[PDB]
Write a protein that binds this ligand. Sequence first.
Ligand code: HEM
Ligand SMILES: CC1=CCC[C@]2(C)CCC3=C(C)CC[C@H](C[C@@H]12)C3(C)C
Length: 424
Amino acid sequence: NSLEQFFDERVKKFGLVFKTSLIGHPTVVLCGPAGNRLILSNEEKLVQMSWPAQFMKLMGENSVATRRGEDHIVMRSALAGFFGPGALQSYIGKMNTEIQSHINEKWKGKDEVNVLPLVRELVFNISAILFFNIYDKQEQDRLHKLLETILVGSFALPIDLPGFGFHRALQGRAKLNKIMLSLIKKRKEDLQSGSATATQDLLSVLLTFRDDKGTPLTNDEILDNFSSLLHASYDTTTSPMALIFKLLSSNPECYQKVVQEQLEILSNKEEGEEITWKDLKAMKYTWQVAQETLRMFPPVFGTFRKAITDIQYDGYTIPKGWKLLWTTYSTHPKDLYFNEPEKFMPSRFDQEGKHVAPYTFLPFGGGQRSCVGWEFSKMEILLFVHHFVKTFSSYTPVDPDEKISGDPLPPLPSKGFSIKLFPR
Ligand code: HEM
Ligand SMILES: CC1=CCC[C@]2(C)CCC3=C(C)CC[C@H](C[C@@H]12)C3(C)C
């Protein structure tokens, strides 16, 4: 297909339930909220997660994404020990500290900056500290470059031959796995030496995890999970953080309301008092602007599933071994579900999204395959906007007619969103 070229390629020639051939598999795209409910609500019952083989070889077969059945449930339980709302509140300080440092170091004293490069650095560095407690900038830059190489092979042709992108990506995964295996060895030692806590980061959470039978996670499962996690954490959270101020510039009224919400929160805090989980909950309108950005520019257009049994959706029957694709482009860009879909209206998510119809806004999927790091991303997006507004009274886009594009899946500012900075 050509996502980087066009999106929303529908076929009035067929019903919302239209069959097609995708990645050499008969795939029926179930367009519409009901098709979304069918695919996302019936997991391990009528359908099962199916990733293309190319991705299976890049992130491994021992991740929560590549595992199905009880194992996937166990792997999600271990991850809930870090991404669960209760635990996630224990990492706000480190995340807030990094975002504040990044803004003060690379943004505060700059007349003009390119957002994309800075957002990618902050997003990855936050993962390096929360996943492996790695603060060494050079080590962070090393692993950042290694992930960039492996990410190039995910969209390239799956040719495992010398001098090919997919081949070099597989070489990067082997290197990253060796580095991560070393981190696992050192962490186990630090834990026995009392040099590391069991909740300081995701590595300790995964190592410290035991099944109801008391069986621990294997090193390969920890490596594959960390790889699948690094893939779902970088180019995803980067899309909204780089596009939020681009859309807020085209809708200054919305930016005004965000600044009003942020400065009000600060007016109720002492000097030196750090942002709190309660402060984050007070950023309701800021979160509505983020959801409006995700609706208009979904970092993930949709995912595929495998028919684990014959399916009788509507009148047509989806036989076992068939593929099923759902798309945010069946509801997000539809006036039927979102009035004036081309218009940026954070008001669409007023009252905590109490007016959003079911299976219409699915930026983080739904069911048992829903995003594991959605609130982790929301925390970063809110803390990022907070520190920006706290530091800058205003900002001016260098090219207000800058376009949005993807190479090929992550929608991002076509030129990095260069902006003039006006420090408070
Ligand atoms: C640190 C950041 C993130 C992490 C660690 C993360 C991790 C994950 C994990 C573990 C899953 C479940 C995979 C499975 O078991 O099948 C998932 C699903 C998903 N994530 Fe993320 N994610 C992150 C950020 C994002 C962002 C920013 C978006 C969108 C803007 C996103 C969109 C999704 C979607 C749509 C799904 C479900 C896809 C489907 O099954 O239909 N994620 N993510
Ligand atoms: C959501 C999800 C969580 C981690 C596992 C997945 C399968 C890795 C492959 C991918 C990413 C690099 C980021 C996002 C989706 C899916 C990923 C696509 C296919 C682009």
